[PDB]
Structure 1
Amino acid sequence: RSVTEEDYLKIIQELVLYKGYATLADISRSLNVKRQSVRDEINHLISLSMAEKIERGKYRLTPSGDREANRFLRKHRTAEILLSRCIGIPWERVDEEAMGIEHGMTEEIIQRTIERFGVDRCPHGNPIPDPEGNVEPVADVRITSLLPDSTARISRIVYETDDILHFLALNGLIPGKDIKIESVKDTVRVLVDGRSIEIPTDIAMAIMVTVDD
């Protein structure tokens, strides 16, 4: 697939949940689009009241751009469920592979997929928005906000890159797994499945967790 508006909405929403803002160069690098085209699209989104400038070089979605993103992510996330549950596309690959089929996911397909597998989250734990673009508020927090000896459950991975998902899969840090914070100096080190894992800051920033209970 070549790049669409919906791809811009998704990456901008991810970067904002991940680090608090989207830059042109971060969008350029994720979408593999030249900066100047990224600039034209951002300005177009701003003129449509779907994005706004936060300060210099830093952007985010407006509330209405966020709902539009959400209507797309309903398609995206359901496509991931379809691909991973029906045909065994690996957990860490399924974000990339959903890219083809997601644009044409109809409500017929989306709803039958949701009811057939009994899910309301993508395999990476992000909730599936409703058709209007609403998502239920989830009570979770950044794993980087936790003190040593905190116990928690991994909730969702808000930014789904290859390096990130591969690390998480390799170390079994997946939605639903109980973890315990061992250390927070330089990296975030946790206890999971009796094993100890150092999570570098760039990866830890993408991990949301729910604190018991």
Structure 2
Amino acid sequence: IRSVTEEDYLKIIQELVLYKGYATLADISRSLNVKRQSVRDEINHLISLSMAEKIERGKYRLTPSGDREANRFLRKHRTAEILLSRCIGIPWERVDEEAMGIEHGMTEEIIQRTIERFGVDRCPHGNPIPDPEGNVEPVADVRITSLLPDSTARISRIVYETDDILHFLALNGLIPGKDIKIESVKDTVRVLVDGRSIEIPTDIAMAIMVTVD
């Protein structure tokens, strides 16, 4: 669809790091649908601008300043999602994708009127909206994969927002604000939610943050 930007790279690297601890060229390539050589050129570029750094062979993350630049973009991205979701009913599982076109043009005027009109400080998937400088409130949540059987918690945010992921979460009502109880962690993470028992596979579970009671 649209031509890929620096901001799109920042966004996916930040997600991947939250999700699995690192970003690889191949993961970025596949997520952005950009050939690996271009991804390599952009990663080197981000590194020479002190926006990103190599963790070890083939693994990268954002620097602190890169992470705050990501956050300044995510303020636009997340508010676009709110706009699209609350105004016109773009489905919860589609709104991350549909926000792509309009997000670069979100001005502070639009962002702040949106925030105040709908009275929100999180995107539909529970992530906080960073302030204009790229800061975010520290939040007290943890990985759902860290909890033991019989722990109870509340879904906080979905840190990695893909298609397979959002769809599964939507289908099973595993959304921000939902109370859950851990039934099992063997092989999958099985939870009690809305009276139903749902097995969450590891690749999906890794994206789920929760707040314990």
Mapped pair 1:91 → 2:120: no
Provide the rounded CA distance (Å) in 2 between the counterparts of 1:71 and 1:113: 16
**Cα drift, residue 185 of structure 1:** 0.3
How many angstroms apart in 2 are the aligned matches of 1:121 and 1:2? 27
Deviations 1:41-99 (Å, cap 9, x if unpaired)? 00000000000000000000000000000000000000000000000000000000000
Cα distance per residue 1:165-203 (max 9 Å; x no partner):
000000000000000000000000000000000000000
CA distance in structure 2 between the aligned counterparts of 1:129 and 1:65, rounded to whole angstroms: 14
Q: Determine the structure 2 residue equivalent to 1:10.
A: 11
In structure 2, runs of 5+ residues without a counterpart are none
Q: What is the CA distance between 1:17 and its match in structure 2?
A: 0.1
Q: What's the TM-score, normalizing by structure 1?
A: 0.99
Distance (Å, rounded) in 1 between the aligned partners of 2:178 and 2:196? 12
Instruction: Give the Cα separation in 1 of the matches to 2:5 and 2:68.
Output: 17
TM-score (norm 2): 0.99
Give, in angstroms, the shift of residue 210 of structure 1.
Answer: 0.2
Shift of 1:112: 0.1
Q: Provide the rounded CA distance (Å) in 2 between the counterparts of 1:164 and 1:83.
A: 19
Deviation at residue 208 of structure 1 after TM alignment: 0.1
Once the two structures are TM-superposed, the CA of residue 36 in structure 1 deviates from its matched residue by: 0.2
2:155 aligns with: 154
The alpha carbon displacement at 1:157 in A equals: 0.1
Q: Write the distance in 2 (CA, Å) between the matches of 1:78 and 1:145.
A: 30
Unaligned runs of 5+ in 1: none
State how far apart, in whole Å, the 1-side matches of 2:86 and 2:197 are: 29
- What's the C-alpha RMSD, in Å, of the aligned pairs? 0.3
Q: Distance in 2 between matches of 1:155 and 1:170?
A: 17
Question: SS state of the match for residue 127, structure 2?
Answer: coil
* CA distance in 1: counterparts of 2:72 and 2:52, whole angstroms: 16
> Distance between the aligned counterparts of 2:50 and 2:192, measured in 1?
44
Any idea what the Cα deviations from partners look like across 1:144-181, whole Å, max 9, x if unmatched? 00000000000000000000000000000000000000
Compute the displacement of 1:111 (Å).
0.1
1:4 CA displacement: 0.1
Q: Provide the rounded CA distance (Å) in 1 between the counterparts of 2:137 and 2:49.
A: 25
For 1:185-204, what aligned pairs fall within 5 Å after superposition?
A: 185-204=186-205
SS state of the match for residue 175, structure 1?
coil
Q: Determine the structure 2 residue equivalent to 1:181.
A: 182
What SS does the corresponding residue of 1:172 show, helix, strand or coil?
Answer: coil
What's the counterpart of residue 131 of structure 2? 130
Q: 1:121, 1:34 → 2: CA distance?
A: 33
The SS at the match of 2:42 is helix
